[PDB]
Design a binder for this molecule. Structure first.
Ligand SMILES: [Ca+2]
Ligand SMILES: [Ca+2]
Ligand SMILES: [Ca+2]
Ligand SMILES: [Ca+2]
Ligand SMILES: [Ca+2]
Ligand SMILES: [Ca+2]
Ligand SMILES: [Ca+2]
Ligand SMILES: [Ca+2]
Ligand SMILES: [Ca+2]
Ligand SMILES: [Ca+2]
Lengths: 645, 645
């Protein structure tokens, strides 16, 4: 960082030297007309080199030595340490005419050495290191370095219906715990030389991205000032003498999205005062880079924490019930809500994603899932209309996977869609852009649009098989149901009847025979099986799965007027997964040996593994038990900043 | 690329096999109830493996061999070559009950092998290679591969006031020369099996990005069809038997900009017909990636081609004069216009950038610089108002440079600006975003706003010093002018007078003495010298320049009511550079030895090098000779796709 300084004719120039920089000094222009030579004298803590076209001769404090004047011959001035006083560090050059040994005129430089560094934590250990070279850049990888910033999606004070990032005001003292520290460190004399001031500033573009607070009068009357943020581009810092540190707290307002990479910057600058109606000059500038931590989903293979359910009709973790007024006739806590988390070094908390769907429970998250160490976010489309695929039963995430040499440690977000040439339903562009812009989990689009509801959770699920790993992707199969039913028919059970209890029940008698003897049905389910196999191909491709990794659960579908599938009997891939111990819907299949053959079948599949199956009663609404419940999960041990997406 | 195929119970399934893929075939679901075993028979060109949980046993054409039925035991079907007929490649599986050696039922797969590849040139040699693996990706670097696409910024037919990319219609046959070739290559039987069709498609987002034409009835009535583009998302391709190729031409509509990376994609897909009111199924998809070639500026160190001038008052390359009606009272051909070029492998041409400034000559480029092999582009701000910094005298470009290990082969675009905290003038966001999004030349912002006009060309220029390299950045210096004037004063010439001819002339006598004796002036020019030194620091930093690379030309400025600089005498860094041989403005300085001391000074500087100086008369307008002329230049020999920005 080389800065240009020129002496003035017959005059003494006062200047501020910022450590970490070197001065190129021009002694030629200040030379009087007729002077053929120059000698120089300088202070102890000032290093002076005489540079003629690249060759630098370091010179003593008292020169008593002359050089030939020339534009090529110049000075290089460096300073080792900060100044105790505004002066006493100087470089004085005397000029000589060839006819005498006495100087004619002389020029000088009065140096005031200060050290200004804007510091953040770029090595991600949870404390702030002094002047990290990499602080102005952001690098992915375990050996990579950069500062990380959390959004405040949460609420310290219940008195308001908003996240803490929503205002420019800070109320509670615990707020700052979520903010990332930025310290301005300074070394210099008792005060600054006249016409100099230090200023913090951010872009107009970064106004809504960040905010920066300073805490004044700690204990006592303690107050939180908003120095940077919305409507504040700059703040003028008060300089304090000697070694001094100014502690600031930074908060991300916005999440990484379309048009926003997640990267933000804050600058500090030393401004020299020129004159009225003229801009201050940025003598020196230091810069730090924050990256706003993304939003990360939790798959079904992670340890569960909380289980949520709407209300109602009628193990080793808690259950949060959504009652009455909160329900407002909306039975789906799955579709409206996706659980996630955000993390920084030694900082982080759960964050919830609220669906644009805006069911009668739309009011519920904020009022409230939202509170201390619990986050909230939304994307509401303006020009686009909401469909059934924007429900979060259509939003899932895969276990950590490896696809052809590339690692996906946090898994891959799976969302349902339609063929591009179909012209069918799709998730809103805002949500897709959001998830895509999170970019750590690298979203994929399956095909859910052959289903009436259009959700991913209908045809697939993941369960842990406590190696602990490998997660055994479970898919629906109509083929398996027809196979099982044909086997039971050949066993003499073809007259056995589905839907014991309920209705008809046996008044309308639906038997394995009459089901297998249904033509339109078997055609429909052949087509549906194709629809399943396409998704199977996508999953195997993009998730790097073999055929060894898949289990086909018996399922049956029925085609509606839209040529879409609705569950013939309750969908069993619609289950919920807690640490093995499956929540599978009760299929209500036909009875063999006084037992439902479907239950015994899926047991015969999963039970040889650690999985313990449990069957829940529900289906005309229509959805099974995924649509009725949502489970909060414990995050990955893997830190997202160690990736290379 | 593994695709899922299932046999149907007691039935023969017909299917299309696309080469480069392998089929996972399920024989378990199609098995009749009670069958304990299965044997298989298959054609010669069909390879069949029996896979039980990862162990694959390749089997002969006539098996006469039974395996135990099981969900784990499955088939792997591959095909080596395309089919001569829709059938005669098949796999038939017979099922056996344990009580007999005669098959009970059987299932089958009738394979039709076709080969579909969408091909482009990803290795950039100028011809289209067969199925480049890297065609679906775009990589920077000499060893990197990807397809390159030119925008059509030019006009084949003069009858219309628009570039060729502006419509969906193609008229002239030479148009296609600028387009990039994309060939669909096919191998198969005389026709396609029933319920199958091939479709080309692009995104709705890519509608305005690209266009794709097919040429039908060559010679003869030869017609150009627009298959893909604005308002056309898809086109249904006619399948031709045997080895067949369909040639398409692609044209970029839009340049890389804000919100557009420059990358576009075109897909081909094999669709299977399902049924009415149901979407066709994408059995197979191939994808190619084009990147639209950026727009690249030419520095002053490149060989010149054409020289442009407005009109009027009053070597070894031509001169294009802009007359009268075209002028419309606008004397600046520099501010309105920036010359550039675009290139693909074995394709390319000059492209002009038209300023949002919209001077009276705003009409001129299109009407016309625009024609065959000459391009045109514009960025017109909507919400933002134009200033003097949007003129292209404020838009320049550096020679190829190396900054701390990083190479900038095409140079770096230099544009003037103001301090962020000033609140002063700046270039419109649209143009800045454009240049930034070109991204190969990595734009930098100097500080031009201390100048009244606010242009970069005022304080700096580059000239070749025929090593050939190193380009000697020339900067304005008030200090050098004051030094020279003081020397001349001490020589007894202090009574010599500037502006011979003109006015006053000597009636108002402006002498070296009276100039040096001016206080306010010397203060103003000290400040201006600081303004020069800041830019000097920026250039040295970002261009990786030493102090050896700079020459300070004598200059003098005067502060207006805006506290900005206007030339005291004509600005000499405002010159034009053709292959040495400088176009420097005539300074009209004071006379020594019957010669202008400034001319002799800058000669004394530059003439020791290959540069041959020539002085042009002009200044009250105000600008010198850069503002009055613009030179078109020969491009780099360096291909932009070999970079790593
Ligand atoms: Ca707040
Ligand atoms: Ca908070
Ligand atoms: Ca909502
Ligand atoms: Ca908190
Ligand atoms: Ca979900
Ligand atoms: Ca056209
Ligand atoms: Ca054209
Ligand atoms: Ca224009
Ligand atoms: Ca052309
Ligand atoms: Ca220019």
């Amino acid at each position: 960082r080389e800065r240009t300084v020129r002496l003035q004719y017959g005059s003494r120039v006062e200047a501020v030297y910022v450590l970490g920089t070197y001065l190129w000094t021009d002694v030629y222009s200040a030379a009087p007309a007729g002077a053929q030579t120059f000698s120089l004298k300088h202070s102890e803590h000032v290093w002076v080199e005489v540079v003629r076209d690249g060759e630098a001769e370091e010179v003593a404090t008292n020169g008593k030595q002359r050089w030939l004047l020339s534009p090529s011959t110049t000075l290089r001035v460096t300073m080792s340490q900060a100044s105790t006083e505004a002066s006493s560090d100087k470089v004085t050059v005397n000029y000589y005419d060839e006819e005498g040994s006495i100087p004619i005129d002389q020029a000088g430089l009065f140096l005031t050495a200060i050290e200004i560094s804007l510091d953040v934590d770029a090595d991600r250990d949870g404390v702030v290191e002094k002047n990290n070279p990499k602080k102005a850049s952001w690098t992915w990888g375990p050996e990579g370095q950069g500062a990380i910033l959390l959004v405040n999606c949460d609420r310290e004070t219940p008195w308001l219906p908003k996240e803490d990032c929503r205002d420019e005001k800070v109320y509670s003292k615990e707020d700052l715990k979520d903010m990332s520290q930025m310290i301005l460190r300074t070394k210099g004399p008792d005060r600054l030389p006249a016409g100099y001031e230090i200023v913090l500033y951010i872009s107009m573009s970064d106004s809504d991205k960040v905010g920066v607070f300073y805490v004044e009068n700690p204990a006592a009357g303690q107050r939180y000032i908003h120095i940077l943020g919305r409507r504040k581009l700059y703040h003028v810092v008060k300089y304090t003498g000697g070694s001094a540190e100014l502690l600031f707290f930074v908060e991300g307002l916005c999440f990484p999205d379309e048009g926003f990479s997640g990267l933000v910057s804050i600058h500090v600058s030393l401004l020299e005062y020129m004159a009225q109606d003229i801009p201050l000059t940025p003598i020196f500038t230091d810069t730090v880079i924050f990256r706003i931590a993304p939003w990360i989903m939790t798959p079904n293979i992670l340890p569960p924490v909380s289980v949520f359910v709407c209300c109602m009709k009628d193990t080793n973790c808690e259950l949060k019930v959504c009652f009455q007024y909160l329900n407002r006739g909306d039975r789906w806590i799955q579709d409206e809500i996706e659980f996630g988390y955000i993390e920084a070094p030694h900082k982080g908390f759960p964050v919830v994603l609220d669906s644009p769907r805006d069911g009668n429970l739309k009011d519920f998250p904020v009022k409230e899932l939202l509170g201390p160490d619990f986050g909230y976010v939304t994307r509401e489309p303006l020009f686009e209309s909401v469909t059934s695929l924007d429900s979060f039963g259509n939003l899932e995430v895969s276990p950590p996977v490896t696809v052809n040499g590339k690692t996906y440690p946090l898994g891959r977000i799976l969302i349902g869609s339609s063929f591009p040439l179909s012209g069918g339903r799709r998730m809103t562009k805002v949500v897709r852009d959001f998830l895509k812009a999170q970019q750590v989990q690298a979203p994929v689009e399956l095909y859910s649009d052959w289903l009436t509801v259009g959700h991913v959770d209908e045809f697939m699920s993941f369960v842990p098989i406590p190696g602990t790993k490998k997660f055994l992707l479970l898919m629906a199969s109509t083929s398996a149901c027809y196979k099982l039913f044909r086997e039971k028919q050949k066993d003499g059970h073809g007259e056995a009847i589905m839907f014991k209890g309920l209705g008809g029940m046996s008044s309308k008698r639906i038997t394995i025979n009459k089901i297998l003897s249904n033509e339109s049905l078997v055609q429909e389910n052949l087509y549906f099986q194709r629809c399943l196999d396409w998704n199977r191909d996508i999953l195997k491709k993009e998730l790097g799965l073999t055929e060894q990794d898949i289990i086909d659960l018996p399922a049956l579908f029925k085609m509606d007027e839209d040529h879409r599938a609705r569950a013939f009997f309750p969908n069993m891939v619609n289950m919920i997964v807690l640490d093995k111990d499956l929540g599978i819907p009760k299929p209500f299949g036909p009875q063999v040996e006084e037992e439902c053959c479907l239950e015994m079948h899926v047991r015969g599949l999963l039970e040889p593994l650690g999985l313990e199956c449990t069957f829940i009663d529900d289906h005309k609404f229509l959805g099974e038990v995924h649509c009725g419940t949502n489970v909060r999960r414990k995050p990955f041990t893997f830190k997202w900043w160690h990736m290379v997406p």
